[PDB]
Design a protein around this ligand. Structure first.
Ligand SMILES: [Mg+2]
Length: 246
């Protein structure tokens, strides 16, 4: 009846206090108990802690070495059907789109995650990767509900310069009337995990939707509380999305 996903860039590259951060993120995931979990910037040790703490989830990794994405499926409700790792072409950061075809209740789904080129890379390649994600979203089978969710790293109206969004694809944040409480997924003013003195408020973590059923209900943020070490679980904010399986 209900349906929930959580997208989070756990910032696994920040090695400081990584144990307590992983314990906190696992506490959030265990508390909300979502059905699908999209994780970005996961390192093998973090993946080992996740697999150790989350046994009721099937974890599909985007790679093996370095950092990668991961998709966790609640085994008690989400039935894995297929998986495909679509690698980006001119990628200078070893990033790819992780697609996982699943079945929830009686509906088919296509859950996609990605971690596009970061701020240090080439914004043009980030736009190209966005076009590849949207194209792979449109070319999905005309029977499943495609749901993308991940750290897009987009800024400076790159969605408009990349040809815009197609007619059958919409941003869940924009669909809900652009709620201002979950307006920014990366805030250097409230989140003090990079030491950036300047206040840069951007919306990196995003969710794209298309259907052939499922309705986005609510949208929220998580990971806003400081841990015992005085740091947040990540430099990005978690993005919780609740849906209704009509
Ligand atoms: Mg990072």
């Amino acid at each position: 009846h209900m349906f929930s996903l959580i997208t989070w860039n756990i910032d696994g590259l920040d090695l400081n206090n990584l144990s307590e951060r992983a314990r906190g993120v696992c506490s959030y995931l265990a508390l909300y108990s979502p059905d699908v979990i999209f994780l970005q910037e996961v390192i093998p040790p973090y993946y080992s802690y996740l697999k150790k703490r989350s046994s009721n989830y099937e974890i599909i990794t985007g790679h093996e070495e370095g950092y990668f994405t991961a998709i966790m499926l609640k085994k008690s409700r989400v039935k894995l059907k297929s998986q495909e790792i679509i690698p980006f072409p001119s990628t200078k950061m070893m990033r790819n789109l992780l697609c996982v075809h699943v079945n929830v209740s009686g509906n088919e789904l296509c859950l996609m995650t990605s971690h596009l080129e970061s701020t240090r890379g080439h914004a043009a390649e980030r736009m190209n990767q966005l076009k590849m994600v949207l194209k792979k979203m449109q070319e999905a089978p005309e029977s499943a509900t495609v749901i993308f969710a991940g750290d897009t790293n987009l800024r400076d109206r790159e969605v408009t310069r990349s040809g815009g969004l197609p007619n059958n694809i919409v941003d869940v944040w924009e669909f809900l009337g652009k709620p201002k409480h979950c307006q920014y997924t990366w805030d250097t003013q409230m989140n003090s995990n990079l030491g950036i003195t300047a206040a840069c408020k951007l919306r990196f973590d995003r969710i794209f939707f298309r259907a052939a059923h499922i309705i986005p209900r609510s949208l929220d943020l998580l990971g806003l509380e400081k841990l015992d070490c005085g740091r947040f679980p990540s430099d990005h904010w978690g993005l919780l999305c609740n849906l209704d399986i009509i």
